[PDB]
Structure 1
Amino acid sequence: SDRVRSITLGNSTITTQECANVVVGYGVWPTYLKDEEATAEDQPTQPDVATCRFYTLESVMWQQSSPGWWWKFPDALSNMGLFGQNMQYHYLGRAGYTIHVQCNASKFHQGCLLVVCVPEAEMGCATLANKPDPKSLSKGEIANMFESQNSTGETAVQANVINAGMGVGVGNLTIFPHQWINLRTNNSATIVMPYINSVPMDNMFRHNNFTLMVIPFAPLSYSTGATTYVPITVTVAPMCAEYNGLRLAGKQ
């Protein structure tokens, strides 16, 4: 055996029939904050099983023209059950995540996705003298999309895939934790991301941390007759989530 896989977090289990390994952060596995690394003095909440479980985001359809999609974490999870409720009531919070991207096709289908987690993915505006707006940056649990031509917009993100919205060669996104989903061999990608930041904890609304990017480097392709509806689903689980600075809820 060993291509098969089962992951249980909380009251949720994920199983895979054909995976690779599981890529782990920068070799670091997530863990709660240590007293020697801590600065906020209040006793943290560590809900556990109620918050560190698998949340399944909206699905997306892969078509032969899709340039790619991206989601920003914690943003994408701000509305998911108790994880989201804890984000609201707390000034500070930190967490790691197990990200499981799903996509089954057929044997007669072909294509290959890059699944990367880019820590701190500051993005450029389409128009040089402006800053993109919150929504061009993140539509929550709804994927934003890259484009196969220069985006124009007065406040949009310069989404042309080739520069991954960051002004770099999309082909070098590889120094970040990633896996590929080459339909020929794979069907899912699982990446465990430790909490990476220049501070022990941070506010979860004003900072994004890392962005999941799914980019097809070899396009979906198939002969007529084969099913044309090939969704890509994303299930994520916070890991070792702690919060500090409880007060009333909201942004502001």
Structure 2
Amino acid sequence: VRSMTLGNSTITTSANVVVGYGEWPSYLEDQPTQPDVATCRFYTLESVQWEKTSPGWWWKFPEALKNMGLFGQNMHYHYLGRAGYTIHVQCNASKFHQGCLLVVCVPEAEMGCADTDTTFPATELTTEDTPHVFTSDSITGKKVQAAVCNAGMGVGVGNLTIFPHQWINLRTNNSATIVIPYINSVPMDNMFRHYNFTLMIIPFAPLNFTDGATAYVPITVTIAPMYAEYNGLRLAS
């Protein structure tokens, strides 16, 4: 039950870590300044209530870390940047609870609008800290088509296991760890207008319990931006 510290933060943590595409995050006219101190500290988001009827959730990064301290602060100051995003998901469920989650990262998860003719106004995709829930049936309007069985992208939700993923089976384990080594074509991009990957958590087997147990299971997401670097503000020589 080793607990790892990192910065001024510490989290308590089946030590099975999934490294996205087998590559670990690394560094790299042009002059990048990298802040090793801070940024790397764990940023624990608010826990989500997983219930019998919960269809799913998704977060879009780096924009989900918009208000998370110095890392979000750096996003405003620096035009360009890149990071590595260790993600810890800890279900925290009792033995008498049953369920199964897919924790998957899906880089460049372009989503489709509900009303096909028109496009969504830029805030149906993402709010910073709060997740966006999926839906059980089709929806209409100028919001993202958030129906599971398609995961908002038009692909099947069953064969969405090709991305960096982890399975949380409350029977076996309650934890997940995924490492996402900055997948992008350009070496640096603007964090505000570009979403590198979309952490979405989808229950394949729904939560179930008997009448005495707690009606929910709170899922906690923790993000540590690893090897974050930006552009150089100061003049070259």
Same fold (TM over 0.5): yes
Q: How does 1:11-22 map to 2 (within 5 A)?
A: 11-16=8-13, 19=14, 21-22=16-17
Q: Alignment partner of 2:228: what SS?
A: strand
Aligned 8 A contact 1:113 1:218 in 2? yes
Aligned residues of 1:11 and 1:49 also touching (Cα < 8 A): no
**Whole-angstrom distance in 1 between the partners of 2:163 and 2:99:** 21
The answer to whether 1:57 aligns with 2:45 is: yes
CA deviation map 1:105-162 (0-9, x unaligned): 1111100000000100000000111222221100111100100000211x10011011
Q: How does 1:76-225 map to 2 (within 5 A)?
A: 76-153=64-141, 155-225=142-212
Q: Which runs of 4+ in 1 moved over 6 A?
A: none
What corresponds to 1:74 in structure 2? 62
Deviations 1:51-82 (A, max 9, x none): 11100112110010000000000010011110
* Distance in structure 2 (CA, Å) of the matches to 1:107 and 1:233: 18
Question: In the TM superposition, what is the alpha-carbon distance from 1:172 to its structure 2 partner?
Answer: 1.1
Aligned-partner Cα distance in 1 for 2:125–2:7: 30
State the alpha-carbon separation in 2 of the partners of residues 97 and 167 from structure 1. Answer: 26
What is aligned with 1:230? 217
- Structure 1 residue 45: deviation in Å? 2.1
Aligned match of 1:38: none
| TM-score, normalising length: structure 1 | 0.89
Let me know the Cα RMSD of the aligned residues: 1.4
Unaligned runs of 5+ in 1: 34-40, 248-252
Residues in 2 aligned to 1:9 and 1:30: alpha-carbon distance in whole angstroms:
17
CA contact (8 A) 2:33 2:232 kept: no
Of 22, 28, 36, the match for 1:27: 22
Q: TM-score with structure 2 length normalisation? A: 0.95
Q: In 1, Cα distance between the equivalents of 2:202 and 2:147? A: 12
The alpha carbon displacement at 1:208 in A equals 0.2
Any gaps of 5 or more consecutive residues in structure 2? none
SS of alignment partner, residue 117 of structure 2: coil
Q: Is the 8 A contact 1:20 1:186 kept in 2?
A: no
How far apart, CA to CA, are the structure 2 residues paired with 1:22 and 1:235?
14
> Which stretch of structure 1 is more off in the superposition, 125-134 or 78-87?
125-134
Asked if the contact 1:92–1:245 (Cα under 8 Å) also holds between the matched residues in 2, the reply is no
Checking the alignment, whether the CA contact within 8 Å between 1:91 and 1:245 is kept in structure 2 is: no
Residue identity in the other structure for 1:45? T
CA distance in 1, matches of 2:52, 2:233: 47
Displacement of 1:5 in angstroms is 4.9
- Equivalent in the alignment of 1:36: none
Asked if 1:8 is matched to 2:2, the reply is no
Aligned-partner SS, 1:87: helix
CA 1:5–1:213 in structure 2 vs 1: closer, same or farther (change >3 Å)?
A: farther
Q: CA deviation at 1:44?
A: 1.9
